[PDB]
Paper text:
Glutaryl-CoA dehydrogenase (GCDH) is an acyl-CoA dehydro­genase (ACDH) which catalyzes an intermediate step in the metabolic breakdown of lysine and tryptophan. Unlike other flavoproteins within this family, GCDH (EC 1.3.99.7) performs α,β-dehydrogenation as well as decarboxylation of its sub­strate glutaryl-CoA to yield the product crotonyl-CoA. Like other ACDHs, GCDH from B. pseudomallei (BpGCDH) exists as a homotetramer with tetrahedral symmetry and possesses an overall fold similar to that of the human enzyme.
Additional structures of BpGCDH resulting from this effort were obtained by soaking apo BpGCDH crystals in drops containing our Fragments of Life (FOL) ligand collection prior to data collection. The crystallographic water coordinated to the Arg97 side chain in the apo structure of BpGCDH remains in place when FOL544 is bound, but is displaced by FOL239 and FOL6421. In all three of these cases the Tyr373 side chain is rotated approximately 90° from its position in both the apo BpGCDH structure and the human ternary complex. This new position appears to facilitate ligand binding by providing a parallel aromatic surface that aligns with the heteroaromatic rings of all three fragments. Despite the presence of 100 mM HEPES in the crystallization condition and the soaking drop, neither the apo structure nor the other fragment-bound crystals of BpGCDH showed electron density for this buffer component that was sufficient for modeling. This appears to be a pH-dependent effect as FOL6421 is the only acidic fragment in the set, it is present at high concentration during the soak and no structural differences are found to account for this case. In all four fragment-bound structures Thr376 and His377 are flipped out of the α-helix observed in the apo state, partially occupying the binding pocket for the adenosine moiety of FAD. This perturbation results in a new orientation of the catalytic YEG motif. Thus, the binding of small metabolite-like ligands induces a conformation in apo crystals of BpGCDH that partially fills the FAD-binding site with protein residues.
Numbering used by the authors:
A (entry chain C): 4 to 142, 148 to 352, 356 to 394
B (entry chain D): 3 to 141, 149 to 186, 191 to 393
C (entry chain B): 4 to 141, 150 to 187, 191 to 350, 358 to 393
D (entry chain A): 3 to 141, 150 to 188, 190 to 353, 356 to 393
The structure:
């Protein structure tokens, strides 16, 4: 048997050709269209809404959404593969993509009415309408509220750090509704142009600059009864979305790690020092072996998670394992690779690195997935 | 949703065939039943009960990949892995004894032996009636075979040989002019001696000694006819490494299980230790690395069964398993308070064992360098 | 001009003649009398109280205690250099010494009556009397005021020296409710000190319990001049200072053994010293060791001036012990075996004060005014 | 009754002479007064502010150890270190501009130049009226050929700090005579065949201007070749001096990152509790403090030894490597403590600078190998 250094366990062979064609398409697309924009799209934080129709055309948005509602009907593994190819170029692009697929199309599909499903999904799937997701507030114990009024509801509040909001057409806002006996979290579809709805940008981000982020500002915004999500109440709504998004990020972070690895490898092959090429140094070799190992193992982890999700056998806690691992290992590898590079084109690594610094702290600095896993091992929440 | 299994998050148990699961279960019943009760005294006094060979052999745990034709159990590589894991869960020293039998003695006889050699040695090695060892290392090989009427005369020495003082069968690598050839010798050969080595830091539960050859006669029929060069020895080392890749994860799991149960049992300001944020991160890391390590060795095993596994993959897995296992053992050690009291310090036994296992192939991080060359095309 | 790999910053040239003599004296004792014993003593966890008389003789017990009471009247830097030389052989021996000097002699001297100071210090200095320190419990140990003195019930655990001690500095609670120091003597009825055996590390030191069953202490054997936390804490702080030095002696041994091992080894074609991974590990041991020593030296100089706040001991004890453990592990992972001993000792040393990084929390508080 | 100083636990302040403390104070006032207000926008848009050199020289911050005879302040090595620490505390890019003037231009001329060269160049470099650069690294091809009048120079230098704004160029080229050896030449701005195009779009050290040196048959008179050095000792003497100051500077950067993370966690509240109330945050602050404090003792001691001449070059390898390595770790630790994406992100600037600082001397651990060789007597 021959050894494939770039794919030691032959992931390629563990994929259905079905899944493999999706990867190839995603790769062709991201390399063809996103890679030549990335460097200056990142450097100048340039707003860019192209991705959506481009990805929509070739069926890369909401990949697990059935054909019935305009989705491509792909499986969890294929969603994984797509995320990996986009983030191989940049995490900012992957993020915009995560929002559309996991944070908008998933809740609508999962908790929407048939009318909501048949109305919104097709336009999201093709990228005609761009979505955003309204949960996080400036600080469940959320402030944004919906008061019941003649017709439907009246929403007031703010959401912050919302990817896609300054270019969104469909807003999936989460807010509290006082029903009868207690106050529960509910989901709302708002459309752009609705009065009371602002979404100004956030500028000056240190990382994920290639993605556009903003606020969602709601000042007595009216939502008719037909635009509340009927089939969910409470945490289950927002959490289903975050679980799906994290699964994709678990694949996507390994794409960026691979990019850093391949660059570090090619660099030390091309450069010379005190006689030999840099690749001849044992310290360099160890670093390259550590990168290969963690990526190879990480990929088996996410592949297996996706297989389990398609079977319906994967509990939510497994996502914590892979998301945390993929992100933390990708950050370590991005740093390892940074520290191998001289000379202030290779510096796609510095970009990946600052992206991953943000990705690793996006869900906070208290290692929330460690805590989910610790409680799942012991039954005890850490306080 | 689906149920979360903290102890088997990716449900390894369900990626196994039922014969593989049966082998695992039998290996578990044996180790826990027969090795766990011996291990504390065996280690402390550096005793090995050679009856372990006959016991493991009874159950069909020796040379698991050797076909039934030659008296083996005819199992696949995943099963070999599962067995090493259950044995090492108890003690690396016991796993080492088995690693020698199966990978260092039965494998080369099977791959490189004549029909006569395979028929004579393998059934007895498989049942553990005959105990084997592997003579490669020497304190650039000076042990030499010379042609003499009706065979060969071997002179030289091998050092740090596991099983050697209790071996019935010896696979020795020696130069024959000028290639490396493998020879099968039997205890009682005039010229052959196997003095024991005592006072080990780790792997105290396995026995180690030398092989000393002073014109030891080997008849013609006992030279391994179908191999010459480094490939003979290296095929064996590669097989051994594969099972250690699984085994080290067994010991890792024990350390993790001990550490978890310890922090569950203990208190600190009335809060149980598991309330501690730092403890949770540590348990999460232990769980993550074992879970991923296991997916790695399983996939390698499946590839080796289908013949699609290059030898470099073995370097990835053995290095990772041994490396992460040692870090886990050290993580679990430093979580423990006190100084020896309670079998929570069974972590101390696993720890010293893994410190030997992680340096047995030398201080040079050999596998990082194999993998480095494999990536770059450059010997470093 | 000339580089000293074993002393890059020439600590030798930053020490007074006074201090260099004391160092080389503790070195000669340790290497001549302790090194030949340690391997068997560790193996069999064998007790040997003769070590107390041998150190007393050369004046290594209570090195900062005034000549007036039998101590050698040395300075804090000298106490450190001694700890480092003793632990260079074995942490167990250093621990026996830490107890005599910082947990027994320091408190009698610091908080004891003139009567107490004269009766006990002289014989502790010479090692004729052996002392132990009863603070840690399995606080519930207490002194009932009774006729003539006090009756102590309770139990102390993991007490170094206790099964060979003559003098016990025991800490109990008494109502007036506060923490007081008591002095007990071997033989007193209701006082036993059974041995603890089976240790994984520090096997060369003898540890035991102190079991008090209505043990009598006369009124003259309470420490008059301290109450509350400051009592035990004064002792711990001095012991921790010595350990900050000591741990670096063990680290140095590990580094020297690892270095010599790789000089002597051939692998593939060359020596192990040819390997860059090995050289990087060696560069890391040298760095951390050299920096740690500048830290403990400076701390010592500050303590001798009276400019040293107690928080600085937390910095150095944490760092020396943490780095020493790391270096013992790095050394171990280079060896294909006194290192293995130093390693298990330091694994105990590093968790002796708990597994919750108490010194990190002390320093976090000191930086922020906010308790964790 | 001794009080603890969290920000100076070993009272470094009290280990300085008055001399040295006054220098530190002046460097501190200048950097905080004049550099801090510029740094954010200068970093962002890669501002060239050449006026900084005159500002620095005015107070005696350029070429600290150069004697008064030639316009230098005649300070000791410890003072050089204190200056570097205070400048880098604001930004590594400003420290870099200073390192070049002091260690890479004034040191080579003072140490290896003729009397004529020293009196001509040093006074104007000390005041900052003339700005220097140091041309070693290439994209050694750079050749000086003996002609009538002096020397013709051809070649290119790359990544040369200050070069687009330099008045004085210290360029190292190879010359054959009697054999083929590294010599030092001094060129000046406006010399025909000398150009120095600026590099822009840097990831780190964006506050320092860098560029090229392109020599197309550039004429250097006889009087402008450095006459008292040949071979590697020339450049090496400069690099070593530069490293000593970087060893102090990097620790200033670490201190800023530490001070920002501390203030951040005191200012922030989470869960009705200051962030500083968390155990992990306190460990991180303790590690930052420990490593900074210990590093400072090292570079203090190294400077003292250098002032009395007892310091071998290898000690500079230890401290430079430590300071830069620990600074990066501390910078990364603080960065990871900050939750957000877009002033306490002053840490982001220090971080990207330090990532360039830690790779400037090679993709691999050049100093570790110096210390390895030094410990063992064996080369890698
Ligand atoms: C897709 C974006 C918003 N995102 C990111 S990130 O911005 O790509 O890092 N991390 C997430 C975790 C959970 C849900 C969404 C997340
Ligand atoms: C089985 C024993 C000898 N062994 C060991 S060990 O002693 O169990 O660690 N490591 C090995 C690597 C290759 C081949 C054999 C090995
Ligand atoms: C001297 C022994 C008991 N000891 C030790 S140890 O057992 O040598 O590690 N660590 C200590 C910390 C504080 C006080 C005493 C300590
Ligand atoms: C002063 C600049 C050029 N510099 C730097 S840096 O750019 O400030 O990191 N590192 C150096 C190492 C040796 C010599 C000079 C160095």
């Amino acid at each position: 048997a021959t050894f494939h250094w770039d794919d030691p366990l032959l992931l390629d062979q563990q994929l259905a050709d079905d899944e493999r064609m999706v990867r190839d398409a995603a790769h062709a697309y991201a390399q063809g269209k996103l890679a030549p924009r990335v460097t200056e799209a990142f450097r100048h934080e340039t707003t860019d809404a192209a991705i959506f129709r481009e990805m929509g055309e070739i069926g890369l948005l909401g990949p697990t959404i059935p054909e019935q509602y305009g989705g491509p009907g792909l499986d969890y593994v294929s969603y994984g593969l797509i995320a990996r190819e986009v983030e191989r170029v940049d995490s900012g692009y992957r993020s915009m993509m995560s929002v559309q697929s996991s944070l908008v199309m998933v809740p609508i599909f999962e908790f929407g009415s048939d009318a909501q499903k048949e109305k919104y999904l097709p336009k999201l799937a093709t990228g005609e309408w761009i979505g955003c997701f309204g949960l996080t507030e400036p600080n469940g114990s959320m402030v944004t509220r919906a008061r019941k009024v003649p017709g439907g509801y009246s929403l007031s509040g703010s959401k912050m750090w919302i990817t896609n909001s300054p270019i969104a057409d469909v807003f999936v806002v989460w807010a509290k509704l006082d029903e009868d006996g207690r106050d529960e979290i509910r989901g709302f579809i708002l459309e752009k142009g609705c009065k009371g709805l602002s979404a100004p940008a956030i500028h000056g981000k240190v990382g994920l600059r290639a993605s556009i982020t903003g606020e969602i500002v709601l000042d007595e915004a009216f939502v008719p009864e037909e635009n509340i999500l009927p089939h969910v109440k409470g945490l289950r709504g927002p959490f289903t979305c975050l679980n799906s998004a994290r699964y994709g990020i678990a694949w996507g972070a390994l794409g960026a790690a691979e990019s850093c690895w391949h660059i570090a490898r090619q660099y030390v092959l091309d450069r010379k020092q005190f006689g030999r090429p840099l690749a001849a140094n044992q310290l360099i070799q160890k670093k390259l072996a550590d990168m290969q190992t963690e990526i190879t193992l990480g990929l088996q982890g996410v592949l297996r998670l996706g297989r389990m999700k398609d079977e319906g056998t994967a509990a939510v806690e497994i996502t914590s394992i892979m998301k945390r691992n993929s992100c933390g290992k990708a950050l370590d590898i991005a740093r390892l690779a940074r520290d191998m590079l001289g000379g202030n084109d290779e510096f796609g690594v510095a970009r990946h690195l600052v992206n991953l610094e943000v990705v690793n702290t996006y869900e906070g600095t208290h290692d929330i997935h460690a805590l989910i896993l610790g409680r799942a091992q012991t039954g005890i929440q850490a306080f």
